[PDB]
């Protein structure tokens, strides 16, 4: 019995279909396309970590841009919103900075107020009571 | 390229011809026939393969000693070369010792 590959055409069309949008001979020559399709798939898998990394960098830039409109820095806003037990991530804060400018200014005011309470707290020796917004809600 | 553009003619198979409907008959000639005949005696084919099995080297050796005197000069010469090659390959080449 002599066996020959009768459907080798479909074995190469499952690879050449992913290369139809390439440039040059590497979109129609299987020998050239297979090495470029594999690299494209490798980049596709490794790009899921950069996509998450680049999103956060973009959010930080937009949060910083909106904070400077209120005379605040990024370390001052994120650091003092945490001490207010306000657990809003960068994605929401960037969205609030674009679509809710009056709500972001409210958080910028809250972070600025909490920032000033810490400075007053560090000046004293602990005898003075803590700030109004410095109070921490305890969960048991 | 390399694939036909038209379907091949349909393969009509007669599953109930004389040879298929009577395949396997008399395979129990010995057990059911007082062991006068042997099921390997039903086998037809080369006289050096009836009721026997072996690898390629054994088949060539067995064929040479049974029908070697009847083989053609060119065919016998090829058989001798094959035995020479197979002897060296099996007894000197391989992964296991």
């Amino acid at each position: 019995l002599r066996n020959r590959v009768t459907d080798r055409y479909f074995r190469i069309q499952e690879v050449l279909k992913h290369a139809r949008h390439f440039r040059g001979r590497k979109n129609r020559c299987y020998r050239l396309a297979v090495r470029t399709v594999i690299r494209a798939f490798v980049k596709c898998t490794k790009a899921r970590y950069l996509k998450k990394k680049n999103m956060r960098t973009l959010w930080i830039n937009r949060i910083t841009a909106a904070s400077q409109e209120h005379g605040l820095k990024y370390p001052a806003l994120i650091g003092n919103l945490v001490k207010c037990q306000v657990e809003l991530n960068r994605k929401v804060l960037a969205d609030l900075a674009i679509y809710e400018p009056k709500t972001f200014k409210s958080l910028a005011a809250l972070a600025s107020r909490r920032r000033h309470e810490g400075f007053a707290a560090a000046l004293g020796d602990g005898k003075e009571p803590e700030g109004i917004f410095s109070r921490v809600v305890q969960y048991h | 390229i390399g694939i036909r553009l038209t379907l091949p003619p349909p393969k009509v198979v007669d599953r109930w011809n004389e040879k298929r409907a009577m395949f396997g008959v008399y395979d129990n000639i010995g057990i059911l026939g007082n062991f006068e005949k042997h099921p390997k005696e039903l086998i037809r084919g080369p006289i050096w393969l009836r009721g026997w099995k072996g690898n390629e080297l054994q088949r060539c050796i067995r064929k040479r000693k049974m029908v070697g005197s009847r083989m053609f000069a060119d065919d016998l010469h090829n058989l001798n070369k094959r035995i020479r090659y197979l002897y060296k390959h099996f007894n000197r080449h391989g992964k296991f010792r």
């Binding site: 009768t6 459907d7 479909f10 | 694939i3 379907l7 091949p8």
Partner: peptide
């Protein structure tokens, strides 16, 4: 000519899909 029906049958269906794209029916 390579013996085999499954590959030839599968190629005809692919050709039919191309025929639809080139000349879509009403």
């Amino acid at each position: 000519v390579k013996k085999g029906f499954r590959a030839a049958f599968r190629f005809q269906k692919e050709l039919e899909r191309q025929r639809l794209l080139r000349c879509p029916p009403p």
